């Protein structure tokens, strides 16, 4: 019910819940979490920022999580996000 | 950048560290959430690991790393700087 900076190993299912929360404060925190993940991986496992709007990255993360089975949602959020982005925008 | 928001892609070290030290507890908490996204994305991979370490120890080492950073390096991106802080201190293996 609340995303905080102690939530290490954030699971995908909680991330996605906050990410689509009716509470826009939790939505914004989930998106700032996603921002630390993107900034940490961009140009390493997926490419790139001047090729893509942040809204495009957020919508692609949304679609990716929205299609995921619960078996996979229960895994860690960050590697799932990074997987969204890698398959779709690889560096090669 | 007067407030940390999720539009802040490629957040510079200078902005991250300002928010991370802010007197506004809410800005401070957002900066710590940006940090959590970076920890989650890099843990077990460039640095190790969440068991023996509480979040606060991690947060304090990141703070000390930034405090000692030469001014020249604050233009670098916050995420790789946070990763360097943790890799040096909590190397894998």
Residue numbers in the entry:
A (entry chain B): 32 to 123
B (entry chain A): 31 to 123
Could you pull the original sentences from the published paper?
Some Gram-negative bacteria target their competitors by exploiting the type VI secretion system to extrude toxic effector proteins. To prevent self-harm, these bacteria also produce highly specific immunity proteins that neutralize these antagonistic effectors. The opportunistic pathogen Serratia marcescens has recently been shown to utilize T6-dependent secretion of two family 4 amidases, Ssp1 and Ssp2, to mediate antibacterial activity. In S. marcescens, the resistance-associated proteins Rap1a and Rap2a neutralize Ssp1 and Ssp2, respectively.
The Rap1a subunit displays a compact globular structure constructed from five α-helices that assemble to form the highly stable symmetric dimer that constitutes the asymmetric unit. This interaction appears to be crucial to stabilizing the subunit fold since it helps position α2, α3 and α5 close to each other and these segments of secondary structure provide the side chains that form the hydrophobic core of the subunit. During initial recombinant expression tests it was noted that soluble protein was only produced in E. coli Rosetta-gami (DE3) cells, a strain that promotes the formation of disulfide bonds in the cytoplasm and so mimics what might occur in the oxidative environment of the periplasm. This suggests that the covalent bond is necessary for correct folding to occur and for stability of the Rap1a fold and dimeric quaternary structure. Interactions involving residues in α2 make the major contribution to dimer formation. Each subunit contributes a surface area of 1130 Å2 to the dimer interface, which is 20% of the solvent-accessible surface area (ASA) of the subunit (5700 Å2). We therefore conclude that the Rap1a fold has not been observed previously, making it a unique member of the T6SS immunity family of proteins. In Rap1a, the segment linking α2 and α3, residues 74–84, shows high average B factors (temperature factors; 76.4 Å2) compared with the overall average B factor (31.5 Å2) and relatively diffuse electron density.
